[PDB]
């Protein structure tokens, strides 16, 4: 945990985002990383204006400086890989920005549980090798020994909430130096228990308690809290087929380069290769993104906003217009 530098927190700063409303639902990550030499500087000033335009780090003693050094310590513990880079948690933020405050969700929580969810978009995929939780366990590399003998089969997700820890163990990075008792807790267990549930594997079980909840008039207050922010978060991280088509679809072939690879060392290490991960498959992006829509993120999203989250019923109506464009790309091949 080297500290930022003066000169880091500068090169933020300076970046200035002409043209971007990045509160808008068509907010462009991509329009917005090619319009300079510097993305990195760029995304971590989008993130930095996200948190300071919410007003909720001011309330929470939060200074400016603080937000930008975790920002920033986040930053420093992402890799180059196609698809769970800084782009993403930055992509997730932003997205969970619009949930909250476009889609009226903010009225369901606290401006604790705001200002967490905003934060825990940023550490939610730290130091990810852009490698599934499967590859490390089927390969029995050391992380995946560890995550069996420890009887957490989260791999990924604990590696993540480790660095979470980590960061903000330092004051000069702790967004949530301003809290104390059972806030500071509350800030905590919830950052961890949002990241813990981005595991797909506990997907079915995670949208079925928060539908469970939402339908009983009297659930418990926290635990429908609890289960709201990890929907939020869960929804920011499968977001990509709720964005303008070629939005969409520029996700969709940067998480396709990142299976692909995947797929490459599961050979080179002789291990099984999904039908999904092998290059020499040659599967069509159209049929990939439909198939994703009909038995994942159509269903999800509907079943959200018609138990509870109607403000975000746009969601529901970008996937159905980019199935349809991707049944049009079908039907002219
Ligand atoms: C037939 O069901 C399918 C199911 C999945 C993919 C496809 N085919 C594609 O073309 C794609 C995509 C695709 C896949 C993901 C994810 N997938 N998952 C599992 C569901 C396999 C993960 O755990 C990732 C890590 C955490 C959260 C979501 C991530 C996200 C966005 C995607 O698109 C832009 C067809
Ligand atoms: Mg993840
Ligand atoms: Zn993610």
Redesign the pocket.
Known sequence: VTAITKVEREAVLVCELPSFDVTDVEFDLFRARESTDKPLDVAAAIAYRLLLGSGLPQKFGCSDEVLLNFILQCRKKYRNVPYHNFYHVVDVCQTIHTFLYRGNVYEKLTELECFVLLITALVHDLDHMGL?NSFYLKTESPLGILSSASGNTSVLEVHHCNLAVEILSDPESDVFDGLEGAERTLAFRSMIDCVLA?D?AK?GSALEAFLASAADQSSDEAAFHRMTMEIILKAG??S??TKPFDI?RQ??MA??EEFYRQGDMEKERGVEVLP?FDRSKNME?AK??I??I???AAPFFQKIVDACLQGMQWTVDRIKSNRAQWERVLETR
């Open positions: 599934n981005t797909m997907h991280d499968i990509n087929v969409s996700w969709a998480v396709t999904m992006l990939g993104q198939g994703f009909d038995f994942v």
